[PDB]
């Protein structure tokens, strides 16, 4: 059970309680089938249910269908998410933060009414596309060329590791319109892709080590046709557009490993008080007590950091350095906390009948996915050397 | 050099910068001298100057000349003083908190009026006497006993590890008044001991690896005739007074590790931007940028943790688990950050001309001071075993 | 490429090269399919091929068809087999040490002549039964009753976590004959059961996070008739063979983590030179170089530790504390090395298409299998309380 | 004590006990005073005794009174010396391996015949000059010029971090005779500087954080006439000596942290059994036992690694990667071992009355005094990029 020490207001505590009472019996009781089969049978039904509660538009205003709240509520609702089921935790972050908010913050009035009323209401699924096989860390070195032939841009190339690939209806794909410019950041341009366009196609879904349930595949572009009105931001100026959502991504996705740590704690604490060894409960031994103390301290340290950074972001003070730091620290702590939680179960933490191994495989994503720790360390270093 | 992520109000921000300009001219330039001489010559003058600023009774009510603020302001002042000088910060905390809070929470109407004015004004120094040479963590096994000689208490025994021993004019000493009770805790009772009483003396100031300049000695009680009116709390109720102050001293002293971890960064970052190696500044190498990023993220996480836990205790919801967890995490992270901060200076960090060695030696105290790193995990674990 | 720094004889190097050549042709390509399907159809054929090489009874006397080599060569073979497939390595460790090495040290002449030749030639598979569903770490608290009538023992009860269960032909099952004895340790008796006895029914295989391909099932004994000649050790004093087997099983099993670290290094080090980022190979970045340095140093330190401890056991300098220490250190280092190896690949380490995901799930077993990691710390700590 | 696990053959184990007894009867009761006064009054007598005992010049061949043994004996002697007194360990390492090894390897017949007879017996002190005030890690960027005038070399520059500066009678100082070469490494040249030459002087001793007692000061060169016969190796080829000797220096100095953490454990283990709390010895609690297990495992692993690497170099298999890796791992482990040892003592470990405070300060030198960990990881990293 979570306490009010996190600094949440009455409305935020009520929202957390509502998420806790709603995710149970609907999501969590079926995270083990999703993990075993890597498929969500009622994904669209669950998305429609989420759209009714307004969690998809937690940051978007009520004008377009959202709730009109801040990023603190987003990082809060993304901690309840991925807690009951870590599998579907990445899909919500890729839908709301990566696609909806990107159109809300850097979109025009025309584009802000065709896709967002569909995405916020859960009718369509959104996703972001920047990575590619030749550029997974060096995002400014893309190879997808975009040639102009009037009022339509033809995308040609290939991208990899696109979250929610086979099921997203609106995809924000970044492409290079000027591959001959000396500054690599001046050639990138954002585009809006909709399912059913000619030339666009999705490849086979990947069988990832962990986080199975969040669909991911390969995008193939062969003589595409996107109108000029679907350009997100401005042409040859996608540098600030790209590296603005990547910061809110690190800020909001930091709640992911927080939910994983909360889940492994809610699964570890009762188990240590029911399992007995050497005539006593295993929870009374000093080593298990120290493990629980370390896990609780790490969770409480990672939870207050992200929440305070989100509170600072909701007033005008934003920094990519802190947004990367909170998520890298959360992932680095969650990996060790999942390791300790598997260690506390012994033999039972190894079989697939317990979510111990699942939470371990899920925790490893945030360290390599959505930006590796090396990239974040280099960003913090460059931010420290600039001053 | 701090950031607004802490979420402190404008009034709390004023106290942050007020102590910043004061300590950098009154305490910072003499930190090396206090460390190498192990004697604060201006101790009483600095205490009176701080009492003029109102930071001593910052948690005391406004009736006795205090400030009336909360624990967060005391924590931030402690952090600033520890950043200026870790040795003086420990003494400031162990005086202000461990005397004024203990007197206002359990002292009667007469004891508060008698001692608090001159304690807040800086004329009287305070200290807490709970540890013993044979009982550091096991405080319930103390050997100091008290016997009722009519309307008087004859205290016999010794106390060890007392901060500001020879300097404190009013000291809170716990003494066992009964030994026939089945529970060992039911015999401990708190007493107020003044300086100069018959039978009270100090042996000698001891030398420590770190925190040099903070006076610590051994208390010797030889038939000390403490009056019955100097009893703190009630008869045979000292453990409830001790454990209450024990949980609060861990939260307040958390700024010490925070102050040291802020000072190592304030001294390290400007150094990497000056020294050059292999034809470029050392701050541009990835191995240094990664360490700087790790240290900054750890410092910010610990600071947000402490600041959020402090706010919860002012609302009226305090726990003993969180108070031990925050200080344990802060001490460990400050030690691990100072370890890298000394290495970042290379050969220059291994000499006494730079305060990095002092920052490292002062960081180890909070892992073996104000409790123990091992007993904190035990207290945290026993909280889950009781639920 | 292994270095001669390990301090091995020429014959040991030749054996290592022969094992590397044999496993690369027969086991290395199909290593991924065994993990994907959790089945080894060529198990008996591969076991026969190993028996033709003499590595199954490498620690057994030559009179039974074994090689008569020391524990160092056994650790070498374990590291080589775990280098290609971790599950096959665990199976070989459970076969050659838990069953074969147990009979040569505490079995009679007839019991050895009856079982060892088929176990060495690959005809019979060996297994050990210590763990129980209600006693995983506290093996002394086993409840398997072994009451006897005449010249037969009536075993009744279930045991869990039996490696090579469904495929084993000769199994060593520890049972408790006298449950009312005051000494809890002096009530265990080891019995040598075999496939075909009425009442020995094996359960289905267990799906686990790693080591896929090793058949682990629950044994069920219901009024089985075990002859009085199939007794390992002495009656009512089976605790001594149980701890003698436990002290030496942790030494040979240390090659598992060593083989996994060798595999992840031989997969990462070449991969860092055939991957490009920012116009350069990823292996030239200082952070990746530091990761390589840490992984190489940890692998080398653990390997030298295990080798020097194994060589000491060949001259009678055995110690349970050293074996627990080496197995704990090897598991803890292999876990971190497998975690770091995935980060070096980036995204290509989070999919089943690359073996980086398999080696991590297999390395986690060594921290909970064959004794919990905390139990190892307790065993090591109790070894200093008697000096 | 020690175990035969290290594989120490005859004439090596007896030397260990001999050194232990010698240092416990001579050096052990003086380490505290050496660390306190930052000086070693009995330096010349100690060096004479070491020369008479045959430990000085252990690696030197048997021509001038050397022992002619392998590096393993030197490693264990350095380990024992650092275990007795860490401050004297750095001086012994700089004397026996930093100076003598360069003389026996690259020194010609007439050169080594003049200095070694007066250097092995303990008369002269052997110092080394590589780093500079503006070049700590970038040793090839030295600015010490050496102009050639007939058969005389005139050096004009400054050095820093010179161990045993004012006491050394012969100093191997690298000078850049050609500042106009295309490769920066081809310009440096090693020269044998002797005390008493005109234009040579030394500054006052440095006040370091740790290693108090090992003299270190700045070297001053002003028109110092160096004879042409005092050249080491060949002209413009000084890099092929410095780079080839720095690996052996890092290898031999790796025994320092080994003996440091050995003394840490030898002081911690009896204290955990004598000190009692909560009605029993503190050494019986699970946390203390786990810390003891971790420290013992780390010490044994590092010792076995260093010994196995030293055995390889005795057979003619030297590598630059392993020599840096072993000392890096040893220092990084000894730091944490000293931290845990200080933690296990509690409050008593914080005062300078116990040697636990010196162990932490001495362990930090091997991370910055023998090349930083970053440079070591870079050297290890570059070893893989060359394949
Ligand atoms: C919502 C979505 C985007 C979330 C995701 O999950 S996407 C991430 C996955 N792909 C990746 O490649 C990992 C990210 N990669 C990195 O961070 C790399 O370290 C790179 C930054 C790309 C390094 O490549 P490099 O060519 O050196 O790029 P620079 O560092 O020099 O970029 C400087 C230019 O970026 C822009 N920028 C930086 N910070 C911000 C900001 N807070 N808001 C808006 N714009 C920003 C800035 O305008 C600058 O432009 P120029 O001065 O170069 O013209
Ligand atoms: C300046 C600087 C460097 C240092 C400082 O000034 S800080 C002071 C130094 N700190 C210390 O020495 C640590 C001493 N204490 C401890 O470590 C812990 O308190 C423990 C040793 C784990 C206490 O354990 P133990 O001896 O078993 O005693 P118990 O826990 O069983 O408690 C017995 C009685 O404790 C009292 N207690 C415990 N928690 C609280 C609470 N949250 N509020 C009020 N009272 C509490 C409680 O009354 C209990 O009594 P009963 O249950 O018998 O009725
Ligand atoms: C290979 C792979 C596929 C499969 C695997 O995973 S291997 C599976 C095997 N490993 C396990 O099952 C782990 C189980 N863990 C353990 O057994 C632990 O040792 C513990 C049972 C927790 C130890 O706890 P506990 O027995 O209560 O501690 P005690 O001090 O009371 O034990 C004393 C008894 O030790 C026994 N002992 C006999 N020989 C030795 C010997 N040469 N060295 C050390 N101990 C020995 C001795 O019998 C004594 O009991 P008493 O009869 O004297 O009372
Ligand atoms: C307290 C006391 C007892 C212990 C001490 O204080 S000892 C050491 C204190 N001083 C230091 O740690 C600084 C040492 N500095 C370094 O090692 C450097 O920073 C390096 C990481 C090697 C970087 O050197 P860098 O400037 O990049 O130059 P290079 O790496 O290209 O090498 C220069 C030339 O050396 C050659 N070299 C490298 N290794 C060896 C070898 N094992 N034997 C013989 N020659 C070698 C290499 O070929 C190169 O030649 P050129 O290509 O320039 O012609
Ligand atoms: C106002 C005040 C100021 C102080 N200032 C200082 C100061 O500046 N410097 C200073 O050094 N000390 C100071 N002390 C003393 C400090 O409280 C003790 O040093 C500390 O609590 C424990 O150290 P110890 O050696 O005295 O206790 P010990 O109990 O002897 O500690 C020894 C070790 O035993 C371990 N241990 C004990 N019980 C258990 C258990 N059940 N399980 C596992 N491990 C256990 C502890 O963790 C510790 O590692 C101060 C005390 C007071 C009251
Ligand atoms: C005989 C001898 C004895 C010595 N004895 C001592 C002694 O007793 N005590 C002592 O303190 N010193 C001693 N020194 C000096 C010591 O060897 C140097 O201080 C050491 O090499 C590190 O140098 P620096 O810190 O001055 O280099 P710096 O450049 O100051 O190092 C600062 C930081 O820069 C980093 N850095 C440099 N290059 C890179 C890179 N390419 N990538 C990433 N990071 C980098 C370093 O890693 C380090 O973390 C001695 C030197 C010699 C020659
Ligand atoms: C031949 C054989 C082969 C096996 N093969 C496998 C295999 O392939 N895979 C597999 O998963 N398992 C295997 N096992 C089971 C494995 O040995 C047990 O899982 C292991 O001993 C731990 O058991 P447990 O988790 O059931 O014990 P539990 O008691 O359930 O352990 C749970 C937790 O309690 C803690 N604990 C217990 N006592 C103490 C104490 N005194 N202090 C502190 N903490 C304590 C442990 O550290 C652990 O964290 C095998 C067993 C045998 C006999
Ligand atoms: C919208 C979106 C969705 C995503 N979804 C997922 C997902 O569902 N699952 C997932 O795992 N990931 C996801 N990612 C992360 C991204 O796909 C990662 O790049 C992923 O790990 C694929 O890796 P890669 O091998 O293509 O690139 P990388 O992860 O970068 O791998 C390349 C390797 O090169 C090295 N390298 C490159 N430059 C440097 C340097 N300067 N210093 C040191 N090393 C360097 C790396 O650190 C890394 O080891 C997503 C990213 C985005 C933007």
Author numbering:
A (entry chain D), B (entry chain A), C (entry chain C), D (entry chain B): 6 to 392
Question: What do the study's own words say?
Answer:
To elucidate the complex structure with its substrates, an IVD construct with the E286A mutation was expressed and purified for cryo-EM preparation to minimize conformational instability caused by the process of enzymatic reaction. Upon incubation with isovaleryl-CoA and butyryl-CoA, complexes of IVD with both substrates were resolved at resolutions of 3.35 and 2.91 Å, respectively. These interactions confirm that the CoA on the outer part of the pocket is close to the monomer, while the remaining portion extends into the pocket, riveted by S174 and R287 from opposing directions. Although IVD can catalyze dehydrogenation of substrates ranging from C4 to C6, it exhibits the highest activity for isovaleryl-CoA, a C4 straight chain with a methyl group at the Cβ position. G406 and A407, located at a critical loop position in the middle of the helix, provide suitable space for the insertion of branched chains from substrates. Comparison of the 2 acyl-CoAs in terms of binding revealed a twist alternation at the fatty acyl portion, potentially attributed to the additional side-chain methyl constraining space within the pocket.
Isovaleryl-CoA (coenzyme A) dehydrogenase (IVD) is an intramitochondrial flavoenzyme that catalyzes the conversion of isovaleryl-CoA (3-methylbutyryl-CoA) into 3-methylcrotonyl-CoA in the leucine catabolism pathway, transferring electrons to the electron-transferring flavoprotein (ETF).
